[PDB]
Amino acid sequence: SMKIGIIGAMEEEVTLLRDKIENRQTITIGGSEIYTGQLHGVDVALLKSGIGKVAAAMGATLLLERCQPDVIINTGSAGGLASTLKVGDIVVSDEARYHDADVTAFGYEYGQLPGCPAGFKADEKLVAAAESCIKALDLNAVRGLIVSGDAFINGSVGLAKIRHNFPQAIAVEMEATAIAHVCHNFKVPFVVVRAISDVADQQSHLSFEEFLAVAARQSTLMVENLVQNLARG
Amino acid sequence: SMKIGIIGAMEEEVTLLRDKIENRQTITIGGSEIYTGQLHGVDVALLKSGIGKVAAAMGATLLLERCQPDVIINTGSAGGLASTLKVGDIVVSDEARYHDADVTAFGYEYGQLPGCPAGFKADEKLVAAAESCIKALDLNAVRGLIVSGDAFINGSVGLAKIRHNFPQAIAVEMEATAIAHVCHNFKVPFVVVRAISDVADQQSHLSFEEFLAVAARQSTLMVENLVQNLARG
Numbered sequence: 370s371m372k373i374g375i376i377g378a379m380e381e382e383v384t385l386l387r388d389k390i391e392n393r394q395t396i397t398i399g400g401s402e403i404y405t406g407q408l409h410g411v412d413v414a415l416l417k418s419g420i421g422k423v424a425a426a427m428g429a430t431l432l433l434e435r436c437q438p439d440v441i442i443n444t445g446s447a448g449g450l451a452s453t454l455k456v457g458d459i460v461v462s463d464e465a466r467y468h469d470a471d472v473t474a475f476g477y478e479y480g481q482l483p484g485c486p487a488g489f490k491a492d493e494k495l496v497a498a499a500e501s502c503i504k505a506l507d508l509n510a511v512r513g514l515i516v517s518g519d520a521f522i523n524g525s526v527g528l529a530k531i532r533h534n535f536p537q538a539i540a541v542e543m544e545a546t547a548i549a550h551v552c553h554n555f556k557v558p559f560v561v562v563r564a565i566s567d568v569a570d571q572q573s574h575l576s577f578e579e580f581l582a583v584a585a586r587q588s589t590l591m592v593e594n595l596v597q598n599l600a601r602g
Numbered sequence: 603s604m605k606i607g608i609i610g611a612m613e614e615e616v617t618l619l620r621d622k623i624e625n626r627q628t629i630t631i632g633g634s635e636i637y638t639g640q641l642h643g644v645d646v647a648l649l650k651s652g653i654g655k656v657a658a659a660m661g662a663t664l665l666l667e668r669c670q671p672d673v674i675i676n677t678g679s680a681g682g683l684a685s686t687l688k689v690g691d692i693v694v695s696d697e698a699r700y701h702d703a704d705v706t707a708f709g710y711e712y713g714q715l716p717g718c719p720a721g722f723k724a725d726e727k728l729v730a731a732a733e734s735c736i737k738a739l740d741l742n743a744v745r746g747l748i749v750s751g752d753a754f755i756n757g758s759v760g761l762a763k764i765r766h767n768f769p770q771a772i773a774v775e776m777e778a779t780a781i782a783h784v785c786h787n788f789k790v791p792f793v794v795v796r797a798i799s800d801v802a803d804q805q806s807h808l809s810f811e812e813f814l815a816v817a818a819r820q821s822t823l824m825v826e827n828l829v830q831n832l833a834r835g
């Protein structure tokens with residue numbers, strides 16, 4: 370049996386998935402929460418990480434360490450940067466880069482940190498399974514580079530800087546690249562499957578308030594089907 | 603009765619300290635090596651931190667989670683922000699904050715992340731202990747605020763920002779706050795100590811490779827005295 374680990378940051382991003390877990394058990398390790406059980410017959414371990422890179426890092430580390438899932442899906446909300454994107458649309462990582470790391474003085478690519486690739490690559494089979502679920506579920510989706518940082522992007526210079534440095538980035542958020550970095554170090558396959566809550570302009574906080582519940586529902590639909598698809602056929 | 607976790611940025615320090623551990627055992631998890639044993643009769647756990655907040659968090663989490671130390675001592679080198687500091691001063695954190703965290707869109711203080719304090723407070727008796735230890739080595743201990751972030755800040759165009767957003771900040775590097783965050787999450791008292799390698803343009807006498815030779819020796823002795831004085835009571 371495959372065990373699938375699922376990571377979302379916020380209670381609202383995790384609460385629908387957690388309600389669907391059977392035989393559900395809760396583990397606190399300081400003080401992040403991991404819910405274990407079966408989701409549609411598939412062993413899962415669901416982490417609520419909290420917000421940002423170190424919260425994500427510490428939780429992903431405790432998840433891999435304690436529960437030893439075979440695979441990691443990171444779910445939740447994100448700020449759309451691709452032009453097509455509308456609120457509720459799915460984004461799937463083909464890769465993940467930090468938008469706020471810079472050791473370019475020592476020869477690395479912008480966004481790259483030592484001992485890491487410049488971008489972390491999402492596992493191909495997990496990408497293809499997510500795309501299978503997108504098409505089966507008839508969702509609007511875009512596959513691409515997700516960028517992460519300890520900043521909620523809200524227009525102005527913050528946003529401009531990310532579009533200048535990462536013109537191919539499709540979505541921006543605060544945990545995925547930290548999760549991808551942990552999984553590089555543990556050699557565990559990852560994918561991010563998130564939904565758009567805002568478009569990272571100077572209304573993004575208002576949009577996020579308005580549409581976070583839609584982002585959560587849409588990313589939960591994908592994930593709960595993706596765990597079935599991965600764990601069987 | 604005590605177990606003391608030691609996390610060092612400077613490789614030569616971690617080396618010298620490892621070589622002093624009795625009944626040493628080594629573990630590898632997630633590409634981190636943790637050494638455990640007795641230093642001068644005290645149960646320790648030892649780890650060299652990686653570069654940036656995720657790598658450091660990961661390392662910290664695995665130390666704290668596997669070895670359950672009573673306290674964290676976190677060592678390294680930093681850049682000086684206060685024009686009043688001298689290359690060779692040792693900063694002892696009273697507080698750590700992120701210089702590159704921005705959730706101000708939702709009203710948080712700059713550098714603050716949701717669910718966290720705006721700064722992570724160093725433990726007062728470990729600060730005091732670290733200070734005595736520094737002064738007894740004939741070294742100059744300066745207490746205050748350390749900021750960290752995943753951009754290397756030497757020069758720039760940049761460094762204000764840092765002083766603009768954090769007057770009060772006296773030192774900057776890339777891991778401290780991340781280690782401070784994890785310790786706060788596990789409720790483990792910490793102290794962050796940092797040898798000052800350069801001060802903002804008091805441009806500069808000894809190369810970093812030469813600074814590090816001396817710093818890593820002074821810091822090694824500092825750590826073995828601090829471990830003893832904390833054990834003693």
Ligand SMILES: Nc1ncnc2[nH]cnc12
Nearest residue numbers: 447448521522542569573
């Ligand atoms: N605009 C935004 N910036 C960063 N993380 C986000 N998650 C959702 N919307 C976001």
